[PDB]
Amino acid sequence: GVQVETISPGDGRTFPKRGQTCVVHYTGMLEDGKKFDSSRDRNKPFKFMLGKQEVIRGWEEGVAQMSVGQRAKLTISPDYAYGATGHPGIIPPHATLVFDVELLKLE
Amino acid sequence: MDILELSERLDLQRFHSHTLRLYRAVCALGNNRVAHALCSHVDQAQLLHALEDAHLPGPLRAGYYDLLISIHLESACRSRRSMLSEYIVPLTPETRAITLFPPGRKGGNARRHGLPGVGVTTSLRPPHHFSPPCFVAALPAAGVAEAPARLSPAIPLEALRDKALRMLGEAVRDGGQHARDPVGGSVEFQFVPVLKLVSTLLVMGIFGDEDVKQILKMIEPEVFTEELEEGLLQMKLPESVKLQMCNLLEYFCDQELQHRVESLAAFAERYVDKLQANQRSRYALLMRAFTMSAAETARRTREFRSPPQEQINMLLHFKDEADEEDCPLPEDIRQDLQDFHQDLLAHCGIQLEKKPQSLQELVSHMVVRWAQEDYVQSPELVRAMFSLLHRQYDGLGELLRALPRAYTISPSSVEDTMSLLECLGQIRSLLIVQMGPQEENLMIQSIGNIMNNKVFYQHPNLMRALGMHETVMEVMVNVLGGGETKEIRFPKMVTSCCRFLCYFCRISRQNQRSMFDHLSYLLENSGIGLGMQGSTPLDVAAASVIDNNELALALQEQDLEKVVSYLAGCGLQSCPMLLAKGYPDIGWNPCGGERYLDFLRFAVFVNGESVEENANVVVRLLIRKPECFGPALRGEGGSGLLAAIEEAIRISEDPARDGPGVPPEENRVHLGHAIMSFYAALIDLLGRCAPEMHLIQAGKGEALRIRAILRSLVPLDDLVGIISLPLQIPTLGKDGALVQPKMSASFVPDHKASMVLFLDRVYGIENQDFLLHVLDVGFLPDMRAAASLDTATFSTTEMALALNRYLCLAVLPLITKCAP
Amino acid sequence: LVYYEGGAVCTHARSLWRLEPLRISWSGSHLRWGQPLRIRHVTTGRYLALTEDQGLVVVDACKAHTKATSFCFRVSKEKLDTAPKRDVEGMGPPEIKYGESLCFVQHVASGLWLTYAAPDPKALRLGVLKKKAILHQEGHMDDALFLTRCQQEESQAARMIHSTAGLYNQFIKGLDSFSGKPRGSGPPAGPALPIEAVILSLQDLIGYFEPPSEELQHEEKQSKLRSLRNRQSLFQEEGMLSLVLNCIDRLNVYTTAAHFAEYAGEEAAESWKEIVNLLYELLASLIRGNRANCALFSTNLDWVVSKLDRLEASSGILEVLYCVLIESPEVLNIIQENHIKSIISLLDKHGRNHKVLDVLCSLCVCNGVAVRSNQDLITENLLPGRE
Amino acid sequence: ACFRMTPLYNLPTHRACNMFLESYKAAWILTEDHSFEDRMIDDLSKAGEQEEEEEEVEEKKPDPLHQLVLHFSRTALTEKSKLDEDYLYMAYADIMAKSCHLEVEVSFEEKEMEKQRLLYQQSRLHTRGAAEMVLQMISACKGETGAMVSSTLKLGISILNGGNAEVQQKMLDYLKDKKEVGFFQSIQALMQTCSVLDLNAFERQNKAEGLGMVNEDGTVINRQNGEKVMADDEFTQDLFRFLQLLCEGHNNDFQNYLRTQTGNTTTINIIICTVDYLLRLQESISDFYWYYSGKDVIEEQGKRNFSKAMSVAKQVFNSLTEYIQGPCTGNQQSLAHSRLWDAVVGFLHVFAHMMMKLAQDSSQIELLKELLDLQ
């Protein structure tokens, strides 16, 4: 349920691996075009380690297909996301999420 | 459109301001989940932009400032402010270094005051906790009401405080310039939001010493120098800005009070060491006093035969100069305490010029000038200024009223005390929210964490000073008042609170007395605790008086009247939730009657002796309301006690009259067992109300009258008949399986033990023929049954153990008394 | 039926009686011992009477024929029977005091004494503290009665309650006359509705319950608030709130003015919108600022919520909802997801009105206590849409 | 346990520090004296440099003390179910009360100087609405006993001491123009809540003090927790002192107004209420005398309870005397038709037998003197 479209190409050789922290800048929008999250309005990159399932599935599969320095657009299916429940008050049920992710560095 | 276009689109401006109001309302009073949700709508960048936006309309500027406070600062500020009223000072070297005045050379009695809010403070305050707002995190597998409570969204506090300080300085300079276009459209809209933010951060403790010095410079550049810039207090602000300045000065006055408390604690730490060393030395040379003294050595060593509180009272009893003979301290040690007392009085501004030169004079002059410059129209502002003024005029009084909430702990207990303070903070935060399942889980876990803390048991004085029993009582009365007649929700939290209060009573007698101060307050809520099972407010009240002669004697007659009235009500109208479950409708409530009777039993009996003052009142009330005795013992048209017991046994043997006839419910109530349990409890209460043998042989008329009334109520033949009733004995058969009676639905030896107690205390055994007649019908068969049950199989059975208790608590001691 | 009741009844309007001597000229003169007079219940307009069937009851004015409804106050139960006193043309000698004279009420024609009925036992467990009032030949020693003055405000309120109840009952029965009887191309075939009287009474009551102005000084503002609360409590305790609700329901069974005309005629339907708006305004005035009256909607809240979509009195119904939610946390404790969704649909269908936002704000916190259920429901049903 | 108890130098440091804090606040901070009430009142009684315009502003906006009084009056006049506790009003009422009294052959010159000084100190308060504030707070308490009404009564006594005719006139005018029954309803409720001697509580206290209990942390030597016999004796005394001061100086209008309130919708007879309390007190004293009649010598607890009951009785007698002196013929008739005669008969019985009993031992000579002055 993850669809990855490149916006700006990365180095093309470095790829995240399980147990490696990915430092990213993202901007989450609903498929209607409404913004609901972005780490740049907080001026702080978002760190997470691949494999620990700290984030939704679409991020884990989507970022794994990205390279360091790559800017890509991820279209996450609802079942690869918050799904039928949905983040209450934020993301409606059965919502397709669109993200603009940039893999800043792997640490 | 540009949001600044709302300066002319007034309908949209009003709608958006009320939208911000709704944003604040939905996340109000600790709704951190909703605050996290709101972080997705008004983000941190938008909030920070709106703080500095100079062209925003006033309503929107105020709304965005308040929205930032509500989303990110309100919960932490409230939790910290709740904890700011107590002073738990660890005995650490940092505490030891604390002094009332900074080291200086102004004067021996008092140097110059330090800057308020600047210095070292060691009083324990739990840290703030925040969670990063992220909406790509995996959805928790834990269900609702079971996941840990959400924390407030995080926002960079250092950047926020730097921005707030810069904004406040710019606002002060702008107000000095007297521009015709103030930010927000008015001086009020320019200053009130920034001052609110600064006050919130000051209370939260974000600002450091340099930041506090800068804030003091903006408040008053002349008074607050350590060794157009016109300060806030000389800028002629409106009443809302005056109220915010009052909040700031109230914070600084609180800091001064805290500094005084901590300095007193530090001096206590030093002076205690000096006193202990001196007392050890004095005892050492006093052990050799027999070589140069006489029997008057008892006077010198009277110090060491007196409680340590009295020892320290006598050691400190040298103030008035007429008490310099009983105090054995050396003058050098006395001088340190006298010097500290003098410098404390000087620090409170007692005794030892247009510039105020100090916070106290500044605040007093400011308040008086504000009051005499105009007729202040805001009651909140007026109350603020006059509270502030009273604090300045009575600093010693403020300290004296603050000391009861001050406590000193060892540095090794700091982490446990911090955990306990965190749990108490979660408990207090839930005083302002309607009660629910998640809140019930938090209550239960907080109470459990508190009870598993060694501090809660080692410092009952501290736990009493923190108001924790009051807070638990408040939440539990809230849940009881909710649905106080039809159905009680959250019984798990209700019994958690009740068990917590019972253990709190059991910790110490002072805690028990503090709980006893709410005896009627518990009893009035105990009417509807009948449907609930486990620990109840009635149980808490009973535990608040048990085995305490002072509290038993101080028990008011109105409380006993209330309990007896509840008992009479139980003896006339069946139990409603028992009726709602299909049970047959008998004309009374033995289950409730029994639990009121045991409270009366605890009230009239202490330490194995009958409290006659309570016993006489209880007997008089009971005879004044005869329906408390049950359908039997009713007098006219009422069967006897033995007949009632036999009827109850038949009811127990016959289903469709003992239960609903639809444990099966895990707490199944059996009507027959309830009936003989009620009558056994009543007979036990009456026997414990019987006068003591010493009062009897003294010929006291009241004792004789009470004993005669009890004898008239309960006949000896009925007592012996109940004692002589057969008991079901565990037999064997049908492949050898044990046929054991259900002890929750059958005649049990406790019912006989109550009758034995009544027979001993009221009638007694005085003649050999009666003793043998009791033995050969009532006691000997029970002894033989118990002896038979002592086999390989039946020894550990419930009936055998009950028989052993009945024999070793009721029968055998009576026989031992009747041995001659 | 007449009872001796205590408690809150001592400050209610149903305990108010009017003493009417058997004459018109100088009927306001000083009361005298043995002077025959009628006793009239102010709110119900019925006269105390002794009937051969039920004994001591209150009967309508058409059955008060001076033999069943003649009473007198006597200082003592001794059978004086000296002579019939002749009335003087003036105020006369002042005899009976307020709160100091102990008076025995005696039926003139029968000579019976007003006393209680000695309630049968087993009725105390029911909580019935009321004692039935009866006329008996002997009575008891404690049959003396204190006459206590009533405030002019309370007396006027009681008379207004009587008149308003009569008028609105007439209006309700007029509405029910054609409840399901279309007039077709003809007259409604019944007595005319008191349209003008109802409108004027509603306007008078609205002006009667107006809250005191915010520009008044503190002391008189508080005094006026106290008087307003007392009058609201009196009207509520006499059932005027329920009467207004009944009128609102019977007018609300019609969707519009033309629909109302199909049953009552055009001349009556041209005031339908005005009357329903005035009824909602009167209800808001009755419940505004009174927690006791606002708490009555904790059982019937769908009654208010389901009417939010009505187009004729949308502002009035929203104001009623706002007044209810502002005062009663009991109503907040029963708020449900469907109620909140209806309030949000009010925004969706009526536009960006800040009063709906204020209502939603009031749903969250009342008296410093937050309702997590309401907060979460509002957050879930209003924010994620972003519309 | 005395011979085996632990010395102070063996205790933990934190325990010793807590004990030191308790001892220090008990013996050094509480004992410290600091008179700031007069200085505070003088500072708040000054209008600050607003007299350089002398325009038609002669409305003369209140000075800070006047504004404080008006604020307390405002919070008293708010419609509420109950009068909530207010430590700020409590403290300021104590400050105002202490500002007014400030007090072996005193000459007439300094006697009159003391009188005029007291009059001026009372004027500083009653020219700014204190007399109305006291009545409003008494009416607002609605007959609930508590520290708030105690502070209000103490302030009223402080501004009425010596029979201040101006304060009496202001209070009477305020009551007559307001025509509110809440004031006398509250007074009657407070007088009905005043306690008398209780033999059951006395016996319970005897048993409690005989048991001799101690505490956990250390050992308390017969802790002195609150007396439960005539616990509110000071409150009863100040209530009846306030009522007496309303009539002090033979104020005929206020003496009549206490008996009957003409303008009000209902009337409460404070004279008869005082007689009823006197009857209850006399019955309690008779019960105490019967309790101690059999015993040869009255012990210290009984003597102290007798003394406090006698002081309350003295205050009630003085209040009745102030009601009727002048004379007030209406009050005299009301008393002559009350149970005052029964109370006096009981008091005469108690007086005769107590004199005969106490005269037989010199250890009770002080109690006998107190009894004689009560007679």
mmCIF file of N, CA, C and O in Angstrom, chain D residues 139-186:
data_model
loop_
_atom_site.group_PDB
_atom_site.id
_atom_site.type_symbol
_atom_site.label_atom_id
_atom_site.label_comp_id
_atom_site.label_asym_id
_atom_site.label_seq_id
_atom_site.Cartn_x
_atom_site.Cartn_y
_atom_site.Cartn_z
ATOM 1 N N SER D 139 -25.759 39.216 58.366
ATOM 2 C CA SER D 139 -26.902 38.743 57.595
ATOM 3 C C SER D 139 -26.503 37.664 56.596
ATOM 4 O O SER D 139 -27.273 36.728 56.355
ATOM 5 N N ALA D 140 -25.312 37.776 56.005
ATOM 6 C CA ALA D 140 -24.899 36.828 54.978
ATOM 7 C C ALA D 140 -24.519 35.477 55.566
ATOM 8 O O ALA D 140 -24.681 34.450 54.898
ATOM 9 N N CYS D 141 -24.004 35.451 56.797
ATOM 10 C CA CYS D 141 -23.646 34.172 57.400
ATOM 11 C C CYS D 141 -24.860 33.274 57.603
ATOM 12 O O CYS D 141 -24.699 32.055 57.719
ATOM 13 N N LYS D 142 -26.063 33.850 57.644
ATOM 14 C CA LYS D 142 -27.317 33.101 57.731
ATOM 15 C C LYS D 142 -27.364 32.189 58.951
ATOM 16 O O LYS D 142 -27.912 31.087 58.894
ATOM 17 N N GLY D 143 -26.803 32.642 60.067
ATOM 18 C CA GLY D 143 -26.871 31.875 61.291
ATOM 19 C C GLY D 143 -25.986 30.655 61.344
ATOM 20 O O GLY D 143 -26.267 29.737 62.120
ATOM 21 N N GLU D 144 -24.924 30.608 60.546
ATOM 22 C CA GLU D 144 -23.958 29.520 60.595
ATOM 23 C C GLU D 144 -22.771 29.964 61.438
ATOM 24 O O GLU D 144 -22.104 30.949 61.104
ATOM 25 N N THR D 145 -22.514 29.248 62.529
ATOM 26 C CA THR D 145 -21.375 29.567 63.374
ATOM 27 C C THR D 145 -20.079 29.295 62.625
ATOM 28 O O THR D 145 -19.973 28.343 61.850
ATOM 29 N N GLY D 146 -19.086 30.140 62.869
ATOM 30 C CA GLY D 146 -17.800 29.971 62.230
ATOM 31 C C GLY D 146 -16.891 31.150 62.511
ATOM 32 O O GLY D 146 -17.295 32.158 63.102
ATOM 33 N N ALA D 147 -15.646 30.997 62.061
ATOM 34 C CA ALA D 147 -14.643 32.028 62.291
ATOM 35 C C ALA D 147 -14.981 33.324 61.565
ATOM 36 O O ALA D 147 -14.608 34.404 62.033
ATOM 37 N N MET D 148 -15.690 33.248 60.437
ATOM 38 C CA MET D 148 -16.049 34.465 59.714
ATOM 39 C C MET D 148 -17.001 35.328 60.532
ATOM 40 O O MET D 148 -16.790 36.539 60.683
ATOM 41 N N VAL D 149 -18.059 34.719 61.072
ATOM 42 C CA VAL D 149 -19.004 35.480 61.879
ATOM 43 C C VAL D 149 -18.365 35.884 63.200
ATOM 44 O O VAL D 149 -18.690 36.937 63.758
ATOM 45 N N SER D 150 -17.441 35.071 63.722
ATOM 46 C CA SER D 150 -16.732 35.491 64.928
ATOM 47 C C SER D 150 -15.914 36.751 64.671
ATOM 48 O O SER D 150 -15.916 37.681 65.486
ATOM 49 N N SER D 151 -15.210 36.800 63.538
ATOM 50 C CA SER D 151 -14.445 37.993 63.190
ATOM 51 C C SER D 151 -15.359 39.191 62.981
ATOM 52 O O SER D 151 -15.039 40.308 63.404
ATOM 53 N N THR D 152 -16.504 38.977 62.329
ATOM 54 C CA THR D 152 -17.452 40.070 62.133
ATOM 55 C C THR D 152 -17.968 40.605 63.464
ATOM 56 O O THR D 152 -18.063 41.823 63.658
ATOM 57 N N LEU D 153 -18.297 39.710 64.398
ATOM 58 C CA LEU D 153 -18.783 40.138 65.704
ATOM 59 C C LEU D 153 -17.700 40.864 66.487
ATOM 60 O O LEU D 153 -17.981 41.843 67.187
ATOM 61 N N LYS D 154 -16.454 40.394 66.394
ATOM 62 C CA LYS D 154 -15.363 41.081 67.076
ATOM 63 C C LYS D 154 -15.149 42.475 66.507
ATOM 64 O O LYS D 154 -14.905 43.425 67.256
ATOM 65 N N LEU D 155 -15.247 42.623 65.185
ATOM 66 C CA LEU D 155 -15.149 43.950 64.586
ATOM 67 C C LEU D 155 -16.294 44.848 65.039
ATOM 68 O O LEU D 155 -16.091 46.038 65.324
ATOM 69 N N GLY D 156 -17.508 44.298 65.102
ATOM 70 C CA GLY D 156 -18.638 45.082 65.573
ATOM 71 C C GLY D 156 -18.456 45.557 67.000
ATOM 72 O O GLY D 156 -18.715 46.720 67.316
ATOM 73 N N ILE D 157 -17.995 44.667 67.877
ATOM 74 C CA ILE D 157 -17.699 45.053 69.252
ATOM 75 C C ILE D 157 -16.607 46.110 69.285
ATOM 76 O O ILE D 157 -16.671 47.067 70.065
ATOM 77 N N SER D 158 -15.585 45.954 68.444
ATOM 78 C CA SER D 158 -14.465 46.885 68.451
ATOM 79 C C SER D 158 -14.911 48.287 68.068
ATOM 80 O O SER D 158 -14.429 49.274 68.634
ATOM 81 N N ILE D 159 -15.825 48.400 67.101
ATOM 82 C CA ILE D 159 -16.308 49.725 66.714
ATOM 83 C C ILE D 159 -17.482 50.204 67.557
ATOM 84 O O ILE D 159 -17.864 51.378 67.451
ATOM 85 N N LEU D 160 -18.069 49.344 68.387
ATOM 86 C CA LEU D 160 -19.170 49.742 69.254
ATOM 87 C C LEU D 160 -18.773 49.911 70.713
ATOM 88 O O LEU D 160 -19.627 50.280 71.524
ATOM 89 N N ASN D 161 -17.518 49.648 71.070
ATOM 90 C CA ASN D 161 -17.106 49.716 72.467
ATOM 91 C C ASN D 161 -17.355 51.099 73.048
ATOM 92 O O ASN D 161 -17.120 52.119 72.397
ATOM 93 N N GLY D 162 -17.836 51.126 74.287
ATOM 94 C CA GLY D 162 -18.186 52.362 74.945
ATOM 95 C C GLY D 162 -19.539 52.918 74.574
ATOM 96 O O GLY D 162 -19.905 53.990 75.070
ATOM 97 N N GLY D 163 -20.292 52.231 73.722
ATOM 98 C CA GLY D 163 -21.586 52.717 73.292
ATOM 99 C C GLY D 163 -21.481 53.871 72.321
ATOM 100 O O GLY D 163 -21.927 54.982 72.617
ATOM 101 N N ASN D 164 -20.891 53.621 71.156
ATOM 102 C CA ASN D 164 -20.730 54.659 70.145
ATOM 103 C C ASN D 164 -22.090 54.988 69.544
ATOM 104 O O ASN D 164 -22.632 54.217 68.743
ATOM 105 N N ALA D 165 -22.639 56.142 69.931
ATOM 106 C CA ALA D 165 -23.975 56.522 69.489
ATOM 107 C C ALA D 165 -24.034 56.697 67.979
ATOM 108 O O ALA D 165 -25.050 56.381 67.355
ATOM 109 N N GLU D 166 -22.959 57.200 67.375
ATOM 110 C CA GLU D 166 -22.955 57.390 65.930
ATOM 111 C C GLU D 166 -23.016 56.057 65.196
ATOM 112 O O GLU D 166 -23.773 55.907 64.229
ATOM 113 N N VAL D 167 -22.240 55.072 65.650
ATOM 114 C CA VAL D 167 -22.284 53.751 65.032
ATOM 115 C C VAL D 167 -23.643 53.104 65.253
ATOM 116 O O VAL D 167 -24.186 52.447 64.355
ATOM 117 N N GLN D 168 -24.214 53.269 66.448
ATOM 118 C CA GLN D 168 -25.543 52.725 66.702
ATOM 119 C C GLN D 168 -26.572 53.340 65.767
ATOM 120 O O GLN D 168 -27.422 52.633 65.212
ATOM 121 N N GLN D 169 -26.506 54.658 65.577
ATOM 122 C CA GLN D 169 -27.435 55.329 64.679
ATOM 123 C C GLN D 169 -27.266 54.842 63.249
ATOM 124 O O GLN D 169 -28.255 54.604 62.548
ATOM 125 N N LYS D 170 -26.020 54.686 62.796
ATOM 126 C CA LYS D 170 -25.794 54.208 61.436
ATOM 127 C C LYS D 170 -26.340 52.800 61.246
ATOM 128 O O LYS D 170 -27.003 52.516 60.240
ATOM 129 N N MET D 171 -26.080 51.906 62.202
ATOM 130 C CA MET D 171 -26.585 50.542 62.089
ATOM 131 C C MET D 171 -28.105 50.513 62.082
ATOM 132 O O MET D 171 -28.718 49.804 61.273
ATOM 133 N N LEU D 172 -28.734 51.277 62.977
ATOM 134 C CA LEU D 172 -30.189 51.283 63.039
ATOM 135 C C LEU D 172 -30.795 51.854 61.764
ATOM 136 O O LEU D 172 -31.784 51.319 61.249
ATOM 137 N N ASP D 173 -30.212 52.933 61.237
ATOM 138 C CA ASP D 173 -30.711 53.508 59.995
ATOM 139 C C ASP D 173 -30.572 52.530 58.841
ATOM 140 O O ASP D 173 -31.493 52.385 58.031
ATOM 141 N N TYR D 174 -29.426 51.850 58.747
ATOM 142 C CA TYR D 174 -29.239 50.877 57.679
ATOM 143 C C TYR D 174 -30.260 49.753 57.776
ATOM 144 O O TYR D 174 -30.872 49.371 56.771
ATOM 145 N N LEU D 175 -30.467 49.221 58.981
ATOM 146 C CA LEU D 175 -31.433 48.142 59.146
ATOM 147 C C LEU D 175 -32.839 48.602 58.789
ATOM 148 O O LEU D 175 -33.581 47.884 58.110
ATOM 149 N N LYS D 176 -33.216 49.807 59.219
ATOM 150 C CA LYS D 176 -34.568 50.282 58.960
ATOM 151 C C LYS D 176 -34.792 50.595 57.487
ATOM 152 O O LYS D 176 -35.901 50.392 56.982
ATOM 153 N N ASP D 177 -33.775 51.093 56.780
ATOM 154 C CA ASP D 177 -33.984 51.368 55.363
ATOM 155 C C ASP D 177 -33.956 50.090 54.534
ATOM 156 O O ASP D 177 -34.657 49.995 53.521
ATOM 157 N N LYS D 178 -33.159 49.098 54.938
ATOM 158 C CA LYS D 178 -33.119 47.857 54.172
ATOM 159 C C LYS D 178 -34.346 46.991 54.425
ATOM 160 O O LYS D 178 -34.812 46.308 53.507
ATOM 161 N N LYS D 179 -34.879 47.005 55.649
ATOM 162 C CA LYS D 179 -36.064 46.221 56.005
ATOM 163 C C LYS D 179 -35.870 44.739 55.696
ATOM 164 O O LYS D 179 -36.776 44.067 55.200
ATOM 165 N N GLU D 180 -34.681 44.223 55.987
ATOM 166 C CA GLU D 180 -34.373 42.826 55.727
ATOM 167 C C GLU D 180 -34.497 42.012 57.008
ATOM 168 O O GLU D 180 -34.114 42.465 58.090
ATOM 169 N N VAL D 181 -35.071 40.813 56.881
ATOM 170 C CA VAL D 181 -35.233 39.921 58.025
ATOM 171 C C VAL D 181 -34.040 38.998 58.213
ATOM 172 O O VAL D 181 -33.955 38.309 59.244
ATOM 173 N N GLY D 182 -33.115 38.967 57.253
ATOM 174 C CA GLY D 182 -31.979 38.073 57.350
ATOM 175 C C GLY D 182 -31.098 38.347 58.548
ATOM 176 O O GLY D 182 -30.558 37.414 59.145
ATOM 177 N N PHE D 183 -30.953 39.616 58.927
ATOM 178 C CA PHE D 183 -30.083 39.958 60.047
ATOM 179 C C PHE D 183 -30.570 39.319 61.342
ATOM 180 O O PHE D 183 -29.815 38.619 62.029
ATOM 181 N N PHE D 184 -31.841 39.526 61.682
ATOM 182 C CA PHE D 184 -32.350 38.961 62.923
ATOM 183 C C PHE D 184 -32.581 37.463 62.821
ATOM 184 O O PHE D 184 -32.480 36.765 63.833
ATOM 185 N N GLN D 185 -32.865 36.940 61.626
ATOM 186 C CA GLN D 185 -32.913 35.489 61.480
ATOM 187 C C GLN D 185 -31.556 34.866 61.778
ATOM 188 O O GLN D 185 -31.466 33.856 62.488
ATOM 189 N N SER D 186 -30.485 35.468 61.258
ATOM 190 C CA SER D 186 -29.141 34.985 61.544
ATOM 191 C C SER D 186 -28.810 35.118 63.024
ATOM 192 O O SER D 186 -28.204 34.215 63.610
#
